[PDB]
Design a binder for these strands. Structure first.
Ligand SMILES: [Mg+2]
Ligand SMILES: [Mg+2]
Ligand SMILES: [Mg+2]
Ligand SMILES: [Mg+2]
Ligand SMILES: [Zn+2]
Ligand SMILES: [Zn+2]
Lengths: 550, 351, 550, 351
DNA sequence: TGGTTAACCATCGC
DNA sequence: GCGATGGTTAACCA
DNA sequence: TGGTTAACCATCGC
DNA sequence: GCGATGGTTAACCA
DNA sequence: CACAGTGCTACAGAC
DNA sequence: GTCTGTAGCACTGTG
DNA sequence: GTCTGTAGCACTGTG
DNA sequence: CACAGTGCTACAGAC
């Protein structure tokens, strides 16, 4: 017959509801069997191994303010809310894995592949056990429009925030004095099967009380985790690891309320640097990264305290937009996806503006503006094959950003110098497009990384020259970032778009199916099985069972 | 006594179950709000006015010399009345920050300067604390005392997160009553000394303190150790003498058993206690007029306002005194599409 | 290994995407195989023996103005719109089966069970092959909110219309002089697995142009189909069938739209009778069913021609709601689902009214109405475990009208002679519920059918006396029908609920799962696959492979 | 010769690609709303009024004598001008019904009484048709002729559903040009006799007819069989004679090729032809002044109104003359959420 | 005058 | 479509 | 006066 | 949540 | 009186 | 004595 | 000579 | 430069 684990992989990888899988199993058993598939119960006990709270492990030194028990599974995210009618309400439904246990079950999942690396690298598998380093991308995204279930209660919001992490790489260092050798480097970080769901809530991310009240313990786990080395028995030998966290693949609204900024359309645009709106439109390309987490903290402390006794606006100008207190560190960087979409919405604006001629008529009425858009979308429907979307998805963004698509707009634009202007513009943008999209720019697209700065100078001078009528005193957030800070963060991090929110947001799609297809389903246990089945979806130990190579 | 149903108009999203209404120099000010302060109100404090059934909130600018406090949800409020040196202040400590925490820093909120048209500048100065300092805690109470004739502030009650050593990532939002030690807070300088009570075997929370000359009556509040609400009423009597304060506490063992009560001053020292809860499924409908006699506190039951069905059957409710015998309560509402205003508001009045 | 068809039904009946099926197949083959499942191509080959346009059949006489070719599969529902720019647009995308071919597949697929009926009846399978009669429930429903695809075009609406049919029964009459004997009586018509999708459109259903355009051919082959008799070789013997057509399981907006009546809240509130609102409020319970298709046509001619030369309102009062011309004949009946829902929304209004006394205060402020709904839903969720809902779903409607929920809302209403008023009201209503909603009332719940009329009298004058402040000059459509025309129909049919809109509008869930996971997906090719895979889902022959004697 | 953009205010939802604007006794009337008449308009006819860039529609009540016609999409419209004893008619036949069908019942529309506030009561009398009746057809044209001195109608062009042999469930919505036979329609009584003659080898469709003094000029139609747009121009000459009519027709060597064209009567018999299409993708831009001389029709190309980008790049467009040398056109608009005005409207004017 | 307070619009990101 | 910023304009209380 | 007149309402069903 | 009916009231053209 | 699930614990019927 | 299979639970989504 | 397996196609849904 | 599908026809590699 079939091995139980292999079968279980057949199940979770093909998206099979346990009910549906029991249907199939029963059938093939009763009809010409001699059963092949293993019945539900052996599957259920076979997956005990994969889920967190299985493999025994220990940190050194022991974590500050964390439980030492390693067998703990799904926990209600409340983390002890005393549910007094008098106190803050219990409204939230949440289920999360305790961070470190999730981490070990995700990494002990890669034991085979890190052994693979150690063998392939021609390193001794027995030698150098303690010199491991592990780079991990954490991510968080809110997802609206989640149907509430009738249930027993509690009455709970229709928004759901989903929080996850992906293991990007593991590299040896010790002996020392080296680059460190990369044992494992994830091939497709932009895949949903590379993303392991950590936590599940029903909360709006604009509701700060509740969100901080759930995610607080998690962040604590992080601040502890940055120090101690992990210790796991792996591949037969007990080895010691390290952990590097990159908070990345957040949308900007989320960065700003989590990094405690004033958001998102204010006169202080950039997360990374202090430049104002008009100040940034004045000179675009030249900026240096300044603001970080520790900085945001000291800034809050000099806002809340306000030692020099400045009034509202001068104080707001001293701290450059730090009002709220940041509770979470985020490595400074630009999301590939949302920046792409942002630039595409700005270009949507520009195209709209060149349908009629809007630098000749400084303030046109709303009517012929709607008229203009209808023109633009009729055209974009004909050529480029594009439905007039409500909110702009990244797919649209990728389809409209081409020389090819810009051509469709070139047709309507009345004059030649403008028609040529936005074409030249798009060419300039596409030459700089892969640097924040492509996985590893250093190699994949070397010259476009080499020539970026000059090219952005070109672009910005095109704006300042022929497009100034729009960009006189203003420029968008993301467009600013992409015309300023790309070279810096690439030559620092080494990659961008490798760190993209793409992996995480895609995860949201899975959530929905899992909630609908693989849930209980009731408000008591839903997140239980969503989170479970999802974590079982991402596991490489099942996935290479599904490879069954060739 | 009667109620007038209110419409929230705009700005209904800035109230959350914990919050404060401070009555000083005429108009009363909403303090605390959902989330961090937005730029519509960089301070976070809102002046509130009620006209013709209409509830209105407006921004309050801060003076240059002021600090800016976070929107604390369940702070201990004490009105420090007009006298030397500077009238007249609302004392706030310490509340619970929207990014979830407890501010252990005590804020001193004063009125600074008017006019012109309905415009008041408020100044917020946190007073640094030398001690012996009190822990970060929330939902407790603080009240003003005057003894011979030196003035101080008595601090008691409340909850906190489990002590740093025993706190887990699994048990965090587990929250325990704080130890039964009062703090005598000298408002100048910041020295507030801790004091232990032979008569207090347990931490109390959401209790409601009232105060008059050198005396404070703690009206009953939730206990999380035994999960019960004591009918007993706490009386404490402080005597401030150089160089050491002497506090004595006694029990009058019959009174109201209540939690999260709205205290609205009507007469000179006589508040009406509107009041929050009987049991944890039960909310107090019966309203209690509380006078303070030098002999002792006494409470006469007042005929409760006629409750419209909604406020009668709600699970939870909250509010604060507008002052002058008038108070504001709020009932959480639900239907989809969301209301959008999560709370319906009622005005209620004596006489 | 195992049989191709059995496997094909391991897929289709378990909701398995062909790609996913291929994933699993490849895995189980490569790992310890000795392949078990059949590769995709023999599945695709196997399902050609099920889908319509397979089995050869013949009608006599020949169907008027319909093609005689029996092998035709999926047809684009356009029926060849000439797509001149100048003519009416080609905007609609549609895929339908040719009706009769669909039927013969959905029937010869019941061949096993019909022979089963013959041998079980102890009838001789060789004798009496002519006297077969088949009663079929056709249905139609609009489903809003369908995303466009970016596609090549054409521009197409975000609404879909899904038209289907279920075979309800087959009975033998000949020799003659008898009841007719029921060979096959469907056990669960309210199941989605009993409903076979016949036609699929992207069209708004309030768009009459395009709806009549695409759905026209269908109705025509209907008007032909009811006359000629079908002839099919089945069980080895060529046998002759008759067909009976019951239009049922339409929403009322759809009804009114299709018979050319006023919609839906007008002064003429009845599909099955001529009474106005006021006339219905005065005397509630006594009405005799009148309306039908043929004289609805005569009515349209009376309106359009206006032979006696009458004023607009006099003419509209004479012809009583007939302005438009009826396209399609439907049976005069009440849909179970939307009636449960509509009576429940009426009751929602009555409870809402009985919270604050609304007969004491002739009109409220809107504010205190909002207040009333707030308290109502807060309490309802408290006890009855019901979240507030934006629309009235049937499930909510079922958890709503009970003694439970009425005694839940009886806590609020302060008056104690009003309490047992609406309580006794609900008791009466519950006593009259199963008569329309049961599968076969004559059998299942005989005494409630027996006592209906008297019971509805009681209900009615309970309204007219106690509740009159609301019901003075007005009442609900559905609430009118259910207090009048239930007894008339269930002795004209034998059931109401058996004919309900459940089978069809359960089919929408399947439309969305299939389009989303079992479609192409390109705007051109998608409907083909939704429709095909769905038809394969409903097939009995594929379904009975899923127990095989449990 | 200029354009102005119009806003459709409320009710743009009742305009659809096939429709008709009838100019009689001053004000002009929209006809053929989308779908069956909603009771906001039981008639199905809308008085349309344009003021200050604003397009407005108003319900038109029907007189007691009238038959209420369905909202037919592409009927043949002919203005029957005021004379003994008729005045004054808009003749409509037959269009195609919203429930998709073809009418083949000729409606005679007329004005009856007014105002008093300048309401207009209208009356619709379908005229029964004796003799061989013109088959159900749509998108054709019909026009008025006057000869010695008897007045009649001439009917030509159009398409129809397949003849009830080729009739199919698979081929249904597929149409075909009707046979090239004109119908001479005596408006009293309902006798309409069919006629033919060799110079017509095919049915033209969506062509525009113009009528002056017993002569009718048909601008290029759309032929389906050979799927092309003849630059040939049809001229028919009818002599009405007791007791038999004589029709002789001829061709113009060259002329205009356009389908679905709008004709606005600027002068006496001279209309500016706005025009629909030169091709199955490319749509006609240049506008053509067409005068009718007794010698023969002639077309002077007029400088086309400067087009805004939208109307120039549209795939399809449609409209009708408001009259007064002024016409209304519409461009289908795409974006979501649906505007929900399915069409942007433009007014275009000559001189 | 003055600043409410609305009110609207255009900006910016989700 | 939703929430928050920011500036112009406009309603309104003194 | 008169008929809009756009509006706003509550009504009814999807 | 969208669309259509019906009547009350209120804006407005003559 | 919709129905076929929805995953899991509980407890029976089977070698 | 282990293995296997259905029932219990509250509630779904299509309206 | 039949059986089997991946590539081509345009486009998806998560933002 | 997201990714893992989405079902089907086309055409190759395999006994
Ligand atoms: Mg979000
Ligand atoms: Mg429906
Ligand atoms: Mg519908
Ligand atoms: Mg997001
Ligand atoms: Zn910057
Ligand atoms: Zn009736």
């Amino acid at each position: 017959g079939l091995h139980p684990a292999v079968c279980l992989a057949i199940r979770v990888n093909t998206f099979l509801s346990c009910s549906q899988y029991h249907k199939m199993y029963r059938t093939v058993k009763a009809t010409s069997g001699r059963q092949i598939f293993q019945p539900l119960h052996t599957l259920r006990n076979a997956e005990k191994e994969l889920l967190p709270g299985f493999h025994q492990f220990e940190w050194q030194p022991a974590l500050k303010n964390v439980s030492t028990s390693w067998d703990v599974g799904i926990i209600d995210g409340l983390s002890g809310w005393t549910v007094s009618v008098d106190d803050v309400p219990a409204d939230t439904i949440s289920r999360r894995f305790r961070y470190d246990v999730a981490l070990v079950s995700a990494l002990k999942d890669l034991e085979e592949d890190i052994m693979e690396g150690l063998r392939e690298r021609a390193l001794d598998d027995s030698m150098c056990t303690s010199g491991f380093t592990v780079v991990v991308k954490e991510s968080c995204d809110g997802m609206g429009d989640v149907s509430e279930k009738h249930g027993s209660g509690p009455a709970v919001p229709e928004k759901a925030v989903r929080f996850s992490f992906t293991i990007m790489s593991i590299s040896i260092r010790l002996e020392g004095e080296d680059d460190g050798i990369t044992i494992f480097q994830e091939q497709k970080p932009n895949s949903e099967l590379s993303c392991r769901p950590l936590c599940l809530m029903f909360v709006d991310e604009s509701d700060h009380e509740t969100l901080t009240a759930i995610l607080g313990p998690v962040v604590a786990e992080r601040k502890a985790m940055m120090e101690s080395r992990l210790i796991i028995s792996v591949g037969g030998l007990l080895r010691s690891f390290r952990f590097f966290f990159r908070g990345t693949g957040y949308d900007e609204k989320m960065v700003r309320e989590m990094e405690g900024l004033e958001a998102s359309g204010s006169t202080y645009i950039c997360t990374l640097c202090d430049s104002t709106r008009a100040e940034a439109s004045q000179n675009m390309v030249l900026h240096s990264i300044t603001r970080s987490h520790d900085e945001n903290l000291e800034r809050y402390e000099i806002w809340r305290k306000n030692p020099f006794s400045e009034s509202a606006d001068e104080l707001r100008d001293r701290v450059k937009g730090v009002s709220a207190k940041p509770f979470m560190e985020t490595q400074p960087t630009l999301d590939a996806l949302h920046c792409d979409i942002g630039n595409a919405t700005e270009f949507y604006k520009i195209f709209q503006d060149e349908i009629g001629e809007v630098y000749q008529k400084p303030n046109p009425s709303r009517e012929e503006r709607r008229r203009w858009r209808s023109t633009l979308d009729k055209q974009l429907r004909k050529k480029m094959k594009l439905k007039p979307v409500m909110r702009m998805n990244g797919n649209y963004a990728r389809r409209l950003m081409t020389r090819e698509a810009v051509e469709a707009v070139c047709e309507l634009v009345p004059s030649e110098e403008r028609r040529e202007a936005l074409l030249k513009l798009m060419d300039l943008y596409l030459q700089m497009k892969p640097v924040w999209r492509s996985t590893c720019p250093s190699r994949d697209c070397p010259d476009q990384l080499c020539q970026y700065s000059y090219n952005s100078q070109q672009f910005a001078d095109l704006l300042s020259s022929m497009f100034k009528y729009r960009y006189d005193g203003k420029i968008t957030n993301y467009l600013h970032k992409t015309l300023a800070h790309v070279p810096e963060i690439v030559e620092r991090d080494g990659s961008i778009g490798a760190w993209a929110s793409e992996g995480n947001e895609s995860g949201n799609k899975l959530f929905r199916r899992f909630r609908k297809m693989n849930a209980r389903q009731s408000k008591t246990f839903e997140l239980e099985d969503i989170l479970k089945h999802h974590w079982l979806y991402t596991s490489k130990y099942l996935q290479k069972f599904m490879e069954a190579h060739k | 006594m009667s109620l007038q149903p209110l419409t929230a108009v705009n700005c209904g999203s800035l109230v959350q179950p914990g919050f404060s209404l401070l009555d000083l120099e005429g108009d009363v000010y909403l303090f605390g709000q959902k989330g961090w302060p937005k730029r519509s109100c960089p301070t976070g404090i809102f002046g509130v006015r009620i006209k013709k059934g209409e509830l209105k909130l407006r921004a309050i600018s801060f003076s240059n010399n002021s600090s800016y406090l976070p929107p604390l949800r369940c702070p201990a409020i004490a009105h420090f009345e007009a006298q030397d040196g500077k009238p007249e202040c609302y004392l706030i400590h310490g509340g619970r920050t929207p990014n979830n925490e407890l501010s252990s820093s005590l804020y001193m909120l004063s009125v600074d300067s008017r006019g012109c048209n309905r415009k008041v500048t408020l100044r917020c100065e946190e007073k640094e604390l030398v001690g012996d300092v009190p822990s970060a805690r929330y939902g407790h109470t603080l009240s003003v005392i005057n003894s011979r004739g030196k003035t101080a502030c008595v601090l008691f009650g409340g909850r906190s997160y489990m002590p740093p050593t025993e706190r887990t990532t699994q048990n965090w939002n587990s929250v325990v009553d704080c130890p039964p030690q009062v703090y005598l807070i000298d408002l100048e300088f910041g020295c507030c000394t801790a004091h232990t009570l032979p008569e207090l075997t347990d931490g109390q929370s959401f209790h409601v303190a009232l105060a008059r000359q050198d005396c404070v009556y703690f009206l009953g509040g939730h206990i999380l150790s035994s999960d019960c609400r004591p009918s007993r009423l706490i009386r404490l009597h402080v005597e401030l003498l150089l160089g050491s304060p002497v506090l004595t506490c006694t029990i009058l063992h019959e009174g109201l058993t209540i939690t999260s009560a709205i205290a609205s001053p009507i007469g000179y020292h006589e508040y009406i206690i509107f009041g929050g809860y009987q049991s944890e499924t039960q909310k107090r409908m019966e309203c209690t007029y509380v006078g303070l006699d030098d002999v002792g506190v006494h409470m006469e039951s007042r005929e409760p306002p006629q409750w419209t069905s909604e406020i009668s059957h709600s699970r939870t409710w909250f509010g604060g005194s507008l002052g002058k015998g008038t108070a504001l309560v709020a009932i959480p509402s639900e239907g989809n599409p969301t209301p959008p205003e999560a709370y319906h508001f009622y005005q209620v009045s004596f006489q």
